[PDB]
Amino acid sequence: GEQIFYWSPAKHWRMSDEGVVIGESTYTGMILEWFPEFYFFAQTGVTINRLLERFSSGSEKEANEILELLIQDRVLVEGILPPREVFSPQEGLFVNPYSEQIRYSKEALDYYVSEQLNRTHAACRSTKIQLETSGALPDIIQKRRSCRRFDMKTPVSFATFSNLLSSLKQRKEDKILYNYASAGGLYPIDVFVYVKPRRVEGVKAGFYYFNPADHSLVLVNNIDQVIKDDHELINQDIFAQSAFSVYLVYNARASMPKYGAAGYFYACIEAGIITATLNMVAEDLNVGLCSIGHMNFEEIQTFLKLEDHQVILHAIEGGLKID
Amino acid sequence: GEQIFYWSPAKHWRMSDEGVVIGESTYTGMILEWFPEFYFFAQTGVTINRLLERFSSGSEKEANEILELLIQDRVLVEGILPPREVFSPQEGLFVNPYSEQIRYSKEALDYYVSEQLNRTHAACRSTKIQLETSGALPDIIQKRRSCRRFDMKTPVSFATFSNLLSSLKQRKEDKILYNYASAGGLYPIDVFVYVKPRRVEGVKAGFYYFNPADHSLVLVNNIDQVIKDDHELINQDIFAQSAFSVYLVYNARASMPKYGAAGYFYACIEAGIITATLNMVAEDLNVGLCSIGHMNFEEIQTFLKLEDHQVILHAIEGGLKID
Ligand SMILES: Cc1cc2nc3c(=O)[nH]c(=O)nc-3n(C[C@H](O)[C@H](O)[C@H](O)COP(=O)(O)O)c2cc1C
Ligand SMILES: Cc1cc2nc3c(=O)[nH]c(=O)nc-3n(C[C@H](O)[C@H](O)[C@H](O)COP(=O)(O)O)c2cc1C
């Protein structure tokens, strides 16, 4: 019925001359009298009305204004946090020995990378075992690259697309089995796909939920579409060229009832497993993929009609390779 | 020189009749007068001496006792949190609609699983696209299973072991390349291996750092060993039989200088990619693997001589398959 909000675990606070600092923002007005009790109260799970009844005492317009802002600013949340918010506090614990100019200079960055690729563990002793370089590895593994340019004219055949997604399907064989591992065998990653118009034979544009039990796509949304402004600038041409987008979504209901918060962590690992498994079948079918770290997931989540117990973990752009 | 402690982002607090509640524990004595200022002060990064100078005012033995306990209880920490602590607060946000008896009953669990494997997205419309089941998938992918019984007599040949780990090595080819994807191409997962005595041809028992630039093992620790009590009960026979253990470690210094906290999240995905990539080469070489979700990583971290900027993400047991 009514929405229940919690104090975000990712948000810590502090008093100021200016007001109450929560996260990276300072807040003003009534809220200064509300603390510390407001922090204690909000951790228990409370509605907006119960917050007003407990703290309003004065302009009820002025109180809704600061609550509206704590929801806007994600200090009060309705469900599990998406991964960006889960991890954000770790910035405050990592002491960075490099200069911030790594992020602003392709020349400073090119240097940081070559240094990290030649790193070694500090606690190493002066003994070594040189392994044999000779051995032969599967070509689907060794030739896989991050593909950022696709054939924008030839449609992905329905067979190729079907074959790609059968890597993620179920197999009934004395017991249900997948082609990839999963903590508890709970397989709590919901898989969704956005297909661009005319780019996949047999699949109208839209957002679809991949059902691994049927090996089917089930329509979710044909009204909205993904655009380039939903992508970080560095990725917009990748998206422009891609034929489809895969979205890996954690269903907390498929995991936390058994593993608690550790299941969310396990689902982040499982997201990698799925990406790697897909990326190998792709190379077999001369499909290219590119992982996307970040995107306007706030919008995608709304297009996919996700619930409080579902969050987007990862995204992948795909399509036929040129030539 | 001196150690600098931060208030753990994973820890929230509350006042009580009994005392100050921090995390799932209530604390007593001097600490009740120290709040709220102690919370504000500790977020900035402070030494033990500066804490004493600012709050002692009284029994300095009684103050070291509560600080010793806040460090023991991980309320005050020296670096990035390991994944279990990163995620733990999410339990407080997930509203569980199932009974807790899922965790205590193999019959309640067997039922929760079959229900989650037949789940569907709630926002689905009544349209479907049935994909072709026909397509053929690589056998290294389709036949891969979680292997929990190994040949404990035949040693993994040095060639097989070398070939397995070349999936994780670098390749100089106009530019440095790996066989698997990584955000920013920073490859911030340090790979370590524990080898049991007599179980891998050419590799003495011990902990080793895998250097992907040389394709070498570099000794870290031959004194300590992993034992069964370092494993969850459910996994102890898996470990007992395995020939070696792989540990995937996030080097925050190889990632956060560029991506901030998001690089830690990306490294959790990358851990999956690595596990899947390894698990495919393994199947090619008739090596079995099993992922381990949890283990006494507090001990392993010490055996690997990790620094504040390194945390263990995942573990894998491996060895030759029976017959
Ligand atoms: C992140 C992760 C953690 C896992 N942890 C464990 C574990 O602690 N113990 C275990 O026996 N298996 C573990 N597994 C293996 C799964 O139980 C297994 O993948 C699942 O039962 C499906 O079986 P399959 O690999 O044979 O398809 C783990 C898998 C993943 C992806
Ligand atoms: C978690 C993750 C996120 C990624 N995000 C992006 C991205 O946002 N943009 C991009 O161009 N590439 C992205 N990539 C691809 C990497 O940049 C790529 O794997 C790396 O440069 C190594 O190249 P290779 O795949 O050709 O070996 C991502 C990879 C991973 C594993």
XYZ file of C-alpha atoms and ligand atoms in Angstrom:
708
model
C 0.000 0.000 0.000
C 2.158 2.828 1.350
C 5.878 3.054 0.545
C 8.378 2.185 3.291
C 11.739 3.983 3.283
C 15.035 3.081 4.968
C 18.085 5.180 5.710
C 20.526 4.218 2.985
C 23.473 2.185 4.326
C 25.632 4.052 1.818
C 24.922 7.414 3.518
C 26.873 8.695 6.512
C 26.368 12.029 8.220
C 28.014 14.758 10.228
C 27.062 18.050 11.802
C 28.258 21.357 10.401
C 28.018 25.047 11.053
C 25.955 25.144 7.829
C 23.718 22.216 8.687
C 23.616 18.449 8.526
C 25.990 16.829 6.037
C 24.632 13.602 4.560
C 26.715 12.015 1.864
C 28.368 14.751 -0.139
C 25.623 17.324 0.543
C 24.748 19.745 3.347
C 21.072 20.167 4.300
C 19.407 23.093 6.060
C 16.272 24.217 7.878
C 13.979 22.034 10.022
C 16.218 19.016 9.566
C 18.828 20.351 11.999
C 16.401 19.852 14.922
C 15.401 16.386 13.681
C 18.865 14.898 14.282
C 20.076 12.628 15.727
C 16.669 11.056 16.225
C 15.895 11.148 12.495
C 18.852 8.844 11.739
C 17.849 6.320 14.400
C 14.164 6.408 13.347
C 14.800 6.031 9.621
C 16.912 2.885 9.965
C 13.877 0.885 11.175
C 11.809 1.319 8.006
C 9.201 4.078 8.137
C 6.567 5.631 5.920
C 6.415 9.271 4.893
C 3.348 9.808 7.068
C 5.012 8.333 10.146
C 8.013 10.565 9.504
C 5.757 13.624 9.276
C 3.766 12.648 12.374
C 7.027 12.196 14.292
C 8.947 15.308 13.095
C 6.616 17.797 11.281
C 5.737 20.053 14.241
C 5.608 23.180 12.090
C 5.374 23.872 8.365
C 4.152 20.575 6.911
C 4.990 22.042 3.467
C 8.563 22.689 4.661
C 8.881 19.148 5.956
C 7.668 17.468 2.771
C 10.242 19.581 0.907
C 13.205 18.168 2.779
C 11.821 14.618 2.694
C 11.212 14.929 -1.041
C 14.894 15.907 -1.300
C 16.203 13.057 0.834
C 14.376 10.654 -1.484
C 15.643 12.492 -4.575
C 19.168 12.380 -3.101
C 18.814 8.659 -2.217
C 19.210 9.143 1.517
C 15.823 7.381 1.907
C 15.414 4.283 -0.280
C 12.759 1.566 -0.828
C 14.835 -1.563 -1.508
C 18.298 -2.938 -2.078
C 20.810 -0.455 -3.435
C 22.094 -0.757 -7.014
C 25.814 -1.669 -7.273
C 27.098 1.896 -7.752
C 25.627 2.877 -4.374
C 26.698 -0.353 -2.637
C 30.329 0.349 -3.430
C 30.485 4.167 -3.329
C 31.611 4.364 0.364
C 34.769 2.477 -0.408
C 36.268 5.649 -1.940
C 36.588 7.034 1.584
C 38.765 4.111 2.674
C 41.181 3.801 -0.248
C 44.257 6.013 0.064
C 45.314 6.796 -3.494
C 49.104 7.070 -4.039
C 48.749 8.233 -7.655
C 47.754 11.654 -8.888
C 44.171 12.357 -9.871
C 45.599 13.421 -13.290
C 45.399 9.766 -14.337
C 41.699 10.369 -15.117
C 42.237 13.662 -17.072
C 45.204 12.825 -19.356
C 45.401 10.020 -21.949
C 49.172 10.275 -21.452
C 49.052 9.994 -17.665
C 46.585 7.119 -18.076
C 48.564 5.231 -20.721
C 51.392 5.312 -18.171
C 49.349 4.180 -15.133
C 48.128 1.209 -17.183
C 51.540 -0.005 -18.305
C 52.658 0.286 -14.674
C 49.686 -1.776 -13.406
C 50.186 -4.405 -16.059
C 53.787 -4.857 -14.909
C 52.915 -4.936 -11.207
C 53.962 -7.662 -8.812
C 52.972 -8.708 -5.323
C 55.123 -7.002 -2.726
C 55.540 -10.111 -0.530
C 57.265 -12.215 -3.164
C 60.340 -14.253 -2.406
C 63.226 -14.762 -4.837
C 61.982 -18.125 -6.127
C 60.158 -18.624 -9.441
C 58.554 -21.454 -11.388
C 58.465 -20.646 -15.116
C 55.387 -22.273 -16.670
C 55.198 -23.791 -20.152
C 53.972 -21.239 -22.697
C 53.615 -23.994 -25.321
C 50.101 -25.243 -24.638
C 47.262 -24.596 -27.073
C 44.105 -22.785 -25.984
C 40.619 -22.816 -27.599
C 40.270 -20.301 -30.410
C 36.915 -19.045 -29.156
C 38.864 -17.928 -26.065
C 42.128 -16.690 -27.539
C 40.641 -14.717 -30.459
C 37.839 -13.044 -28.453
C 38.128 -9.248 -28.482
C 35.915 -6.398 -27.347
C 34.010 -5.554 -30.527
C 33.041 -1.881 -30.937
C 32.136 -1.735 -34.663
C 29.285 -3.835 -36.059
C 27.549 -4.607 -39.336
C 24.643 -2.157 -39.119
C 22.954 -3.445 -42.283
C 22.946 -7.256 -42.124
C 20.411 -8.520 -39.542
C 21.492 -11.049 -36.957
C 19.849 -14.217 -38.234
C 17.180 -15.672 -35.980
C 19.242 -18.864 -35.761
C 22.436 -17.097 -34.714
C 20.526 -15.092 -32.114
C 18.686 -18.188 -30.892
C 21.985 -20.076 -30.675
C 23.651 -17.278 -28.735
C 20.927 -17.182 -26.105
C 20.780 -20.970 -25.698
C 24.006 -20.532 -23.727
C 21.753 -19.037 -21.026
C 18.873 -21.474 -21.274
C 17.916 -24.385 -19.067
C 18.253 -28.061 -20.021
C 15.961 -30.656 -18.396
C 18.152 -33.777 -17.994
C 17.302 -35.744 -14.782
C 17.651 -32.310 -13.030
C 17.592 -28.724 -14.407
C 21.018 -27.625 -15.722
C 22.589 -24.487 -17.137
C 25.794 -24.030 -19.156
C 27.401 -21.906 -16.440
C 27.893 -22.028 -12.686
C 25.803 -20.272 -10.032
C 26.032 -20.101 -6.230
C 23.442 -22.470 -4.788
C 22.361 -23.279 -8.340
C 19.755 -20.542 -7.845
C 20.543 -18.709 -11.140
C 19.195 -15.373 -9.777
C 20.239 -13.281 -12.802
C 17.215 -12.240 -14.836
C 18.290 -11.656 -18.436
C 16.719 -8.916 -20.526
C 17.390 -7.802 -24.096
C 16.743 -4.620 -26.019
C 16.591 -5.209 -29.770
C 16.966 -2.349 -32.219
C 14.543 -2.084 -35.159
C 15.325 -4.244 -38.223
C 18.595 -5.509 -36.691
C 17.637 -9.042 -35.612
C 15.724 -11.341 -37.974
C 12.479 -12.435 -36.320
C 12.539 -10.021 -33.345
C 10.600 -6.717 -33.347
C 12.287 -3.794 -31.631
C 11.681 -3.629 -27.911
C 12.672 -4.775 -24.458
C 12.292 -8.472 -23.734
C 12.665 -10.769 -20.768
C 14.618 -13.900 -21.668
C 12.882 -16.903 -20.103
C 15.537 -19.638 -19.648
C 12.941 -22.319 -18.930
C 11.206 -21.924 -22.322
C 14.156 -20.531 -24.299
C 11.859 -17.663 -25.289
C 11.776 -13.892 -25.400
C 8.744 -12.377 -23.664
C 7.824 -8.805 -24.473
C 8.127 -6.266 -21.655
C 8.079 -2.884 -23.444
C 7.688 -1.952 -27.132
C 6.859 1.734 -26.418
C 10.193 3.022 -25.049
C 13.609 2.712 -26.613
C 17.211 3.070 -25.630
C 18.995 6.129 -27.023
C 22.604 7.365 -27.176
C 22.050 9.858 -24.320
C 21.449 6.829 -22.074
C 25.090 5.925 -22.567
C 28.293 7.429 -21.292
C 29.874 9.601 -23.970
C 32.734 7.137 -24.541
C 30.191 4.410 -25.427
C 27.616 6.196 -27.512
C 29.006 5.108 -30.872
C 29.265 1.540 -29.574
C 25.584 1.609 -28.760
C 24.714 3.395 -32.020
C 26.202 0.496 -34.000
C 25.020 -2.411 -31.877
C 22.127 -4.627 -32.943
C 20.950 -5.465 -29.417
C 21.757 -4.782 -25.751
C 21.832 -7.425 -23.017
C 21.007 -6.455 -19.425
C 21.960 -8.666 -16.489
C 19.622 -8.089 -13.529
C 19.941 -9.448 -10.014
C 16.684 -10.844 -8.606
C 17.280 -10.570 -4.859
C 14.238 -12.816 -4.332
C 16.061 -15.616 -6.128
C 19.077 -15.481 -3.779
C 18.901 -13.461 -0.545
C 16.227 -15.736 1.016
C 19.007 -18.347 1.077
C 22.339 -16.498 1.171
C 21.432 -13.075 2.588
C 23.509 -10.191 1.314
C 26.258 -12.642 0.184
C 23.944 -13.734 -2.612
C 24.084 -10.267 -4.096
C 27.853 -10.474 -4.032
C 27.679 -13.943 -5.608
C 25.356 -12.539 -8.302
C 28.001 -9.948 -9.181
C 30.460 -12.782 -9.772
C 27.765 -14.716 -11.658
C 27.267 -11.698 -13.920
C 30.899 -12.104 -15.012
C 30.467 -15.834 -15.562
C 27.473 -15.106 -17.788
C 29.298 -12.394 -19.731
C 32.281 -14.687 -20.326
C 30.076 -17.638 -21.282
C 28.120 -15.531 -23.739
C 31.264 -13.910 -25.120
C 32.618 -17.398 -26.022
C 29.496 -18.618 -27.833
C 29.496 -15.261 -29.620
C 33.010 -15.777 -31.005
C 31.874 -19.186 -32.259
C 29.053 -17.508 -34.195
C 31.046 -14.457 -35.446
C 29.012 -12.215 -33.147
C 30.895 -9.414 -31.419
C 30.171 -8.192 -27.907
C 31.348 -5.297 -25.734
C 30.736 -4.989 -22.005
C 29.399 -1.677 -20.743
C 30.359 -0.770 -17.213
C 27.999 2.134 -16.748
C 24.923 3.589 -18.430
C 21.768 5.421 -17.322
C 20.492 2.358 -15.476
C 17.920 4.528 -13.690
C 16.133 4.791 -17.079
C 16.690 1.200 -18.218
C 15.323 -0.057 -14.899
C 12.125 1.867 -15.609
C 11.878 0.595 -19.177
C 12.258 -2.991 -17.915
C 9.541 -2.355 -15.267
C 11.752 -3.725 -12.511
C 10.626 -4.124 -8.930
C 12.323 -3.146 -5.668
C 14.009 -6.559 -5.549
C 15.662 -6.268 -8.991
C 18.727 -4.166 -9.869
C 20.772 -3.923 -13.056
C 24.328 -5.211 -12.667
C 25.877 -5.122 -16.116
C 25.186 -4.428 -19.768
C 26.478 -5.805 -23.049
C 26.191 -4.497 -26.613
C 26.222 -7.037 -29.411
C 25.867 -7.495 -33.128
C 27.451 -8.992 -36.207
C 31.123 -8.254 -36.782
C 32.182 -6.254 -39.864
C 33.563 -8.386 -42.732
C 54.244 4.683 10.445
C 51.150 4.743 12.659
C 47.916 3.016 11.611
C 44.995 5.186 10.472
C 41.461 3.920 11.136
C 38.138 4.906 9.554
C 34.589 4.350 10.715
C 33.409 1.418 8.636
C 30.790 2.436 6.043
C 29.106 -0.898 6.741
C 28.414 0.071 10.384
C 25.392 2.096 11.471
C 24.515 3.028 15.027
C 21.717 3.856 17.409
C 21.302 4.782 21.041
C 19.812 2.381 23.560
C 18.925 2.171 27.203
C 21.780 -0.371 27.409
C 24.300 1.685 25.475
C 25.371 2.460 21.943
C 24.344 -0.076 19.303
C 26.838 -0.357 16.451
C 26.133 -3.024 13.897
C 24.547 -5.967 15.645
C 26.231 -5.264 19.005
C 25.586 -2.994 21.992
C 28.575 -1.293 23.658
C 28.849 0.072 27.192
C 30.904 2.283 29.492
C 32.899 5.384 28.480
C 31.722 5.125 24.892
C 28.251 6.447 25.739
C 29.718 9.910 26.473
C 31.870 9.819 23.325
C 28.867 9.885 20.969
C 27.873 11.487 18.698
C 31.243 13.170 18.338
C 33.068 9.835 18.066
C 31.145 8.947 14.883
C 31.881 12.297 13.240
C 35.570 12.196 14.277
C 36.212 8.629 13.137
C 34.939 9.184 9.593
C 37.857 11.546 8.831
C 40.617 8.976 9.364
C 42.296 9.082 12.769
C 45.011 7.279 14.677
C 44.567 5.482 17.979
C 46.594 8.152 19.762
C 44.490 10.985 18.360
C 41.374 9.109 19.441
C 42.766 8.720 22.965
C 43.895 12.354 23.147
C 40.422 13.459 22.035
C 38.253 11.118 24.183
C 40.335 9.394 26.941
C 39.688 11.852 29.799
C 39.690 9.116 32.433
C 40.868 5.510 32.561
C 43.248 5.234 29.606
C 43.163 1.441 30.180
C 39.352 1.527 29.890
C 39.539 3.511 26.674
C 42.038 1.221 24.959
C 39.716 -1.669 25.864
C 36.769 -0.304 23.933
C 38.943 0.806 21.006
C 40.563 -2.626 20.889
C 37.013 -4.011 20.646
C 35.862 -1.649 17.911
C 38.841 -2.801 15.840
C 38.162 -6.455 16.689
C 34.498 -5.914 15.746
C 35.472 -4.107 12.500
C 33.853 -0.813 13.428
C 37.285 0.809 12.866
C 39.091 -0.404 9.732
C 42.369 0.386 7.901
C 41.437 -0.018 4.223
C 38.763 -1.078 1.787
C 36.253 -3.565 3.139
C 36.236 -7.171 1.895
C 33.116 -8.114 -0.134
C 31.201 -9.732 2.747
C 31.285 -6.431 4.653
C 30.567 -4.292 1.570
C 27.295 -6.099 0.998
C 26.180 -6.956 4.553
C 23.970 -3.812 4.983
C 21.765 -4.864 2.127
C 20.070 -7.431 4.407
C 18.361 -4.530 6.170
C 16.748 -3.346 2.935
C 15.490 -6.612 1.445
C 12.019 -7.605 2.636
C 11.937 -11.395 2.484
C 8.547 -12.907 1.501
C 9.688 -16.493 2.127
C 10.135 -18.224 5.446
C 13.557 -18.431 7.040
C 13.022 -22.248 7.061
C 14.425 -22.309 3.522
C 17.918 -22.274 5.091
C 17.207 -25.030 7.709
C 15.378 -27.706 5.656
C 16.677 -29.520 2.549
C 12.993 -30.044 1.720
C 12.020 -26.390 2.095
C 15.124 -25.480 0.080
C 14.574 -28.002 -2.716
C 11.176 -26.323 -3.095
C 12.410 -22.696 -3.052
C 14.890 -23.610 -5.798
C 12.391 -25.215 -8.154
C 10.186 -22.150 -7.644
C 13.043 -19.733 -8.474
C 14.039 -21.720 -11.518
C 10.487 -21.420 -12.855
C 10.182 -17.709 -12.075
C 9.162 -15.066 -14.572
C 9.269 -11.296 -14.699
C 6.079 -9.794 -13.337
C 5.794 -7.092 -16.036
C 5.527 -9.488 -18.955
C 2.970 -9.047 -21.684
C 1.179 -11.920 -23.427
C 3.545 -12.021 -26.412
C 6.355 -14.566 -26.854
C 9.121 -15.322 -29.333
C 10.138 -18.995 -29.140
C 13.844 -19.307 -29.980
C 15.452 -22.167 -31.901
C 16.725 -24.865 -29.536
C 18.531 -26.583 -32.433
C 21.864 -24.777 -32.428
C 25.058 -26.518 -31.344
C 27.185 -25.150 -28.509
C 30.892 -25.800 -27.734
C 31.448 -28.955 -25.714
C 33.844 -27.250 -23.314
C 30.835 -25.095 -22.366
C 27.974 -27.580 -22.430
C 29.745 -30.427 -20.590
C 31.301 -28.252 -17.846
C 30.107 -29.257 -14.374
C 31.096 -28.327 -10.843
C 33.608 -31.046 -9.976
C 33.719 -32.069 -6.298
C 35.649 -35.381 -6.477
C 39.215 -35.487 -7.805
C 42.000 -37.953 -8.523
C 44.003 -37.618 -5.303
C 46.838 -39.865 -6.502
C 47.737 -38.804 -10.054
C 49.595 -35.451 -10.059
C 48.437 -32.685 -12.352
C 51.118 -32.723 -15.030
C 53.247 -29.600 -15.226
C 52.071 -29.140 -18.817
C 48.378 -29.367 -17.962
C 48.849 -26.933 -15.084
C 50.934 -24.591 -17.238
C 48.297 -24.750 -19.981
C 45.485 -24.007 -17.551
C 47.167 -20.889 -16.213
C 48.112 -19.565 -19.662
C 44.436 -18.613 -19.919
C 45.320 -15.878 -17.399
C 48.645 -14.819 -18.851
C 49.572 -11.814 -20.943
C 50.459 -11.915 -24.649
C 52.713 -9.204 -26.131
C 51.344 -8.621 -29.665
C 51.634 -4.924 -30.743
C 49.933 -4.185 -27.344
C 49.522 -6.321 -24.178
C 46.499 -8.664 -24.397
C 44.710 -11.129 -22.153
C 42.263 -13.925 -23.021
C 39.434 -12.278 -21.083
C 37.869 -8.844 -20.750
C 38.552 -6.256 -18.042
C 37.142 -2.783 -17.347
C 39.671 -0.223 -18.553
C 41.946 -3.100 -19.549
C 43.519 -2.647 -16.108
C 43.343 -6.374 -15.150
C 43.347 -5.558 -11.390
C 42.791 -9.157 -10.224
C 45.936 -10.570 -8.649
C 45.897 -14.356 -9.001
C 47.304 -16.586 -6.282
C 47.498 -20.371 -6.008
C 47.894 -22.778 -3.129
C 49.320 -26.123 -4.232
C 49.015 -29.199 -2.050
C 52.074 -31.426 -1.532
C 52.819 -33.980 -4.286
C 49.656 -33.045 -6.225
C 51.081 -30.951 -9.080
C 54.126 -32.149 -11.033
C 56.878 -29.533 -10.810
C 55.323 -27.331 -8.087
C 56.292 -27.645 -4.395
C 53.498 -27.148 -1.890
C 52.883 -23.544 -0.958
C 51.203 -20.271 -1.787
C 52.244 -18.614 -5.029
C 51.565 -15.371 -6.827
C 50.813 -15.950 -10.506
C 52.674 -13.335 -12.548
C 50.768 -12.908 -15.853
C 53.599 -10.953 -17.467
C 56.130 -13.805 -17.108
C 53.673 -16.723 -17.011
C 55.381 -17.771 -13.776
C 54.562 -18.756 -10.227
C 56.450 -16.740 -7.605
C 56.662 -18.127 -4.100
C 54.900 -16.162 -1.358
C 54.654 -18.639 1.548
C 55.907 -22.229 1.955
C 55.543 -22.234 5.783
C 51.741 -22.078 6.196
C 49.151 -24.316 4.617
C 45.448 -24.365 4.013
C 43.477 -26.845 6.121
C 39.899 -28.174 6.160
C 38.924 -25.950 9.125
C 39.541 -22.969 6.820
C 36.564 -24.114 4.785
C 32.858 -24.066 5.426
C 31.682 -27.490 6.558
C 29.832 -28.142 3.283
C 33.113 -27.695 1.355
C 35.677 -29.446 3.484
C 35.688 -32.685 1.505
C 35.935 -30.676 -1.718
C 39.057 -29.021 -0.405
C 40.409 -32.295 1.019
C 40.357 -33.829 -2.471
C 41.516 -30.848 -4.505
C 45.048 -30.607 -5.875
C 45.265 -26.804 -5.742
C 43.239 -23.724 -4.764
C 42.989 -20.543 -6.834
C 42.416 -17.197 -5.101
C 41.191 -14.147 -6.999
C 42.299 -10.928 -5.275
C 41.272 -7.381 -6.090
C 44.184 -4.922 -6.186
C 42.428 -1.615 -5.513
C 45.621 0.167 -6.614
C 45.180 -1.301 -10.084
C 41.657 0.130 -10.501
C 40.338 2.728 -8.036
C 42.883 5.397 -9.110
C 40.950 5.392 -12.399
C 37.401 4.218 -11.662
C 36.960 4.955 -7.945
C 34.725 2.556 -6.071
C 33.144 1.403 -9.389
C 36.393 -0.391 -10.155
C 35.861 -2.648 -7.177
C 32.425 -3.468 -8.509
C 33.920 -4.076 -11.965
C 36.531 -6.369 -10.368
C 33.726 -8.466 -8.879
C 32.341 -8.950 -12.383
C 35.872 -9.595 -13.679
C 36.274 -12.317 -11.054
C 33.365 -14.142 -12.714
C 34.849 -13.661 -16.173
C 38.101 -15.187 -14.932
C 36.345 -18.110 -13.249
C 34.347 -18.857 -16.406
C 37.394 -18.505 -18.658
C 39.422 -20.834 -16.475
C 36.550 -23.294 -16.129
C 36.438 -23.641 -19.961
C 40.162 -24.281 -20.445
C 39.879 -26.762 -17.576
C 37.194 -28.805 -19.350
C 39.461 -28.889 -22.406
C 42.232 -30.412 -20.279
C 40.027 -32.808 -18.220
C 40.646 -30.683 -15.129
C 37.698 -30.194 -12.796
C 36.993 -27.008 -10.870
C 34.535 -25.949 -8.163
C 33.888 -22.370 -7.094
C 33.917 -21.646 -3.376
C 31.737 -18.784 -2.255
C 33.051 -18.460 1.265
C 36.034 -19.629 3.300
C 38.149 -18.248 6.157
C 39.516 -15.468 3.962
C 40.804 -13.675 7.067
C 43.414 -16.480 7.319
C 44.134 -16.829 3.595
C 44.692 -13.074 3.358
C 47.376 -13.412 6.026
C 49.003 -16.399 4.338
C 49.153 -14.450 1.055
C 50.690 -11.445 2.900
C 48.156 -9.075 1.380
C 48.200 -5.338 1.917
C 45.405 -2.926 2.838
C 44.659 -2.415 -0.861
C 44.114 -6.124 -1.638
C 41.042 -8.208 -0.736
C 40.070 -11.763 -1.637
C 36.998 -11.967 -3.867
C 36.600 -15.609 -4.804
C 38.176 -19.035 -4.523
C 38.325 -22.105 -6.731
C 39.350 -25.694 -5.982
C 40.800 -27.723 -8.822
C 42.370 -31.017 -9.736
C 42.219 -33.942 -12.114
C 38.834 -35.564 -12.630
C 38.303 -39.197 -11.564
C 38.431 -41.722 -14.442
C 30.009 -17.479 -6.833
C 29.878 -18.986 -6.695
C 30.107 -19.617 -5.482
C 29.984 -20.993 -5.355
N 30.216 -21.551 -4.157
C 30.127 -22.860 -3.959
C 30.385 -23.468 -2.647
O 30.705 -22.785 -1.665
N 30.268 -24.779 -2.525
C 29.927 -25.548 -3.552
O 29.832 -26.767 -3.384
N 29.680 -25.060 -4.770
C 29.755 -23.754 -5.051
N 29.500 -23.244 -6.331
C 29.124 -24.167 -7.423
C 27.584 -24.212 -7.610
O 26.965 -24.857 -6.478
C 27.208 -24.865 -8.970
O 27.691 -24.023 -10.043
C 25.695 -25.169 -9.160
O 25.223 -26.214 -8.282
C 25.356 -25.557 -10.618
O 26.101 -26.720 -10.936
P 26.985 -26.925 -12.235
O 28.192 -26.083 -12.084
O 27.250 -28.376 -12.143
O 26.122 -26.539 -13.383
C 29.607 -21.833 -6.513
C 29.380 -21.187 -7.730
C 29.497 -19.813 -7.870
C 29.240 -19.145 -9.209
C 33.020 -4.957 -16.189
C 33.470 -4.434 -17.543
C 33.046 -3.201 -18.013
C 33.460 -2.722 -19.247
N 33.020 -1.521 -19.651
C 33.364 -1.000 -20.822
C 32.877 0.314 -21.263
O 32.115 0.994 -20.563
N 33.270 0.771 -22.439
C 34.086 0.074 -23.221
O 34.423 0.547 -24.311
N 34.564 -1.126 -22.882
C 34.259 -1.720 -21.722
N 34.757 -2.981 -21.370
C 35.663 -3.694 -22.296
C 37.148 -3.478 -21.899
O 37.531 -2.109 -22.136
C 38.068 -4.507 -22.615
O 37.743 -5.835 -22.141
C 39.594 -4.240 -22.470
O 40.019 -3.050 -23.168
C 40.445 -5.434 -22.963
O 40.142 -5.638 -24.333
P 39.775 -7.027 -25.001
O 38.411 -7.384 -24.553
O 39.861 -6.659 -26.429
O 40.823 -7.984 -24.558
C 34.366 -3.516 -20.106
C 34.786 -4.758 -19.624
C 34.382 -5.246 -18.391
C 34.861 -6.600 -17.899
